[PDB]
Amino acid sequence: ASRVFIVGGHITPFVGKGSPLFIDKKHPDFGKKKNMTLEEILATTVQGTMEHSGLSGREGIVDQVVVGNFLGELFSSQGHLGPAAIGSLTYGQAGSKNPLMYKPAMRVEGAAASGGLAVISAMNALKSGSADITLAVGVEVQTTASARVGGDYLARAADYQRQRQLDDFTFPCLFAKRMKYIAEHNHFTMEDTARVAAKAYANGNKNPLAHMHTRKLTFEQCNGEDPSNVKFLGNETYKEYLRMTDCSQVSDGGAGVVLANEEGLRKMGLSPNDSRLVEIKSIACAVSNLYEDPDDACCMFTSRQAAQKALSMANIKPSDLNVAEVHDCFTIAEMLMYEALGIAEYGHAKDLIRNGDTTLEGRIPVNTGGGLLSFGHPVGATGIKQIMEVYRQMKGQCEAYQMKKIPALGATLNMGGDDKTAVSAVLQNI
Amino acid sequence: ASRVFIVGGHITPFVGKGSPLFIDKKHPDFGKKKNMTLEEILATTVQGTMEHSGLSGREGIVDQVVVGNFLGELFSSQGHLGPAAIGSLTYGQAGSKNPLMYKPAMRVEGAAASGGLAVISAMNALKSGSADITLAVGVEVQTTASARVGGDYLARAADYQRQRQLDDFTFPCLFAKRMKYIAEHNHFTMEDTARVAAKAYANGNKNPLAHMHTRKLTFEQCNGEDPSNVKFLGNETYKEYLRMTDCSQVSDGGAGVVLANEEGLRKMGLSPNDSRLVEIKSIACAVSNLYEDPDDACCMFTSRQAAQKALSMANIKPSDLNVAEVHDCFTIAEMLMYEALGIAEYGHAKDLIRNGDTTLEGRIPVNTGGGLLSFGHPVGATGIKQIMEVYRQMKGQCEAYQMKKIPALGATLNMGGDDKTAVSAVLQNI
Ligand SMILES: CC(=O)SCCNC(=O)CCNC(=O)[C@H](O)C(C)(C)COP(=O)(O)OP(=O)(O)OC[C@H]1O[C@@H](n2cnc3c(N)ncnc32)[C@H](O)[C@@H]1OP(=O)(O)O
């Protein structure tokens, strides 16, 4: 196979309610200035990604662009982000010369796995001989509607005919439903999930890019002792299993990554041992049936398939991983992800979180920058963000949450819907 | 490079207002029976495609699935069609064994070029060594809303902030605007575009799959002499340049194609010279800037770039083509497509249509089954339909519209938005 290299990338701040970067009634610039649009975020992400990757002034050597985005058609009335990305380099500079003109571009989608799917597409282009350098960007804007209205948009990721009726907050409810079963089988507890949140917010507190950077929450708060941490669902059956702090954020943001094969490195004037690089040893996608759910809510069968293929293609095992990024769309999902990735055996994610093994100082740090819970979750961006966080830790770029032991191996696990699409990648430092 | 072969495929009937297959108040089964949902169309298309490709009972050898769809999230409240496709083989047969489980799948999107993009993704997977057999299906349901509401959904293909205000029928208006400029430069006429429609409806009349199969229109009717062929736009500046008969249909439908590399043919027990095959010699994508339009409305620069790359990679010229499928989203676009493909020189599409060169009996027949105008336009399906129509002509399957001279070489040209994304492929008979 042709090898694949992460050359560089960019994560915007992730912003929404609770961030000082978000312009609401509590902001100096309220009334004066607006938050970024989808087009603006896409422009910032594309330009930021080119800059960090050392391509400013030679963007014409990028052969192709893939955008990951889930709901731009709903939140921003805008599809067709392929040609949006082609215009993103020189956005708002009318008539300007554009070195991306006529290149291939498209949007890919699998709910919150859209970013990961974007990386896969780019990687297939690189191994197919139709590209030597690709740009994969993911973006999302979700703050243009309430959390309730957004919850109906996010339900586009579920089997909508079958599952929308559970609750206006369809996804939160689907994970609350997992938690009920999880509790009845004593797989792990609501204490355990509160410990996940405490970790995430503590990690976020060290990350200025994080949506929840300025919010502090104690274990006790996340564990429900605060009455402002409401059990907000409407469905009576599942209401008691989910608190606000268990939920990923409604965020706006972008993440981008430039990927290259060996011929692309050559073109950029780079060697395969260049210390700015990280190798993607493997990536893998697994998709289950939208229309049918397994009974065992304590196992994410699809995410487990993806993680298994990826580590296998990389010829490593979970115990070899030094860092991971997992899809904590809820605290409940982070626990399940530990077991789907394999860093915990079935029923033993509880051990890991009770023992601090996934904190910054633990033996397998996870979601070092705050996860979907604190860093935030602009759905389309998440999958690429995960890649870039492992990259940044590997390159010593994470500042206040930088790991003291630079990780040699990392893994990502990105998930769309209720474990219906999963994408997992193994990353090796250089 | 690994070679790529079309093994087989399937087009559903394309249905909507005017079709006897469409169930509205005037239909015997009104109240009794409903039109197909997006899920049902996807199930029919996936199963139909497997059947005609010879894979029934061994669907497990398909390595991957790519779905093309533009607006399912809006018209049907449904995204995440990747796992929908995974469950499409056994749709409505609960608990059944499913040989597609855990395979890679995703949805791709570039407005009305979504189907073509789906083929490109599949083809990259085939050349990348991550697949030997791929299934590319495209589907769309647009009849769940009024034409006016649908026109706002379709505007997701435009630069929405900039262009939505032109008209509720944003896309029709954008092509009407082209026609104004086209008229002022005498590039071609509204008689010429009526001749395109006459050809499409005559072709449709020989195609039972065609939305408009049962509607007959004379040149004179398409040319405006019928008062029911109304100039329906609201925008005063462009209103006079577009008639209803100039417009593609609001259709529901699906198309699917199985593609394979040489190892995939081996796996299916097939030889590369098997007469059921067509080789995709080349495919190419070109994407321009969503945010800026070129001045010259008489040229589709982006579609021309894509056609040029494809014919060049295939080392052929337009004059070598025996058949073509082009993106006649409007009659106006068919004319521009003849020139973008290269079968007419700049300003000479008028010669071709005045001379009958693109009729079934002409030297370069185009859109033999009726095009987006008559066959209809379920947006995500269109790109794959185009591929399958060239295939079917090449394999002698088109019955009443079958070409008497079996074509050796064909080309497709699929377009998203106002010439912002284009995909073009060269096909060679075996
Ligand atoms: C695979 C994947 O990645 S899935 C994608 C996953 N993402 C999601 O599901 C998004 C999850 N996150 C969210 O929806 C948001 O972060 C939330 C809802 C958890 C927090 O949002 P906020 O804006 O802080 O909450 P908000 O104030 O809108 O209120 C939420 C609801 O909680 C309830 N609520 C709020 N405060 C109270 C209270 N004091 N008492 C009772 N109910 C309350 C209400 O029902 C309220 O809705 P309402 O105003 O319509 O009646």
Ligand SMILES: CC(=O)SCCNC(=O)CCNC(=O)[C@H](O)C(C)(C)COP(=O)(O)OP(=O)(O)OC[C@H]1O[C@@H](n2cnc3c(N)ncnc32)[C@H](O)[C@@H]1OP(=O)(O)O
């Ligand atoms: C670029 C790509 O390839 S992607 C997308 C493809 N392109 C498109 O957008 C085409 C899709 N849209 C269409 O083509 C149009 O929706 C149509 C014209 C085909 C739909 O026509 P129909 O639905 O059969 O007729 P319908 O009755 O809705 O007429 C549409 C509108 O035209 C006007 N109209 C309809 N009938 C009449 C009449 N007898 N007299 C005057 N005006 C009329 C009306 O404004 C009507 O809207 P309204 O009912 O709110 O007033």
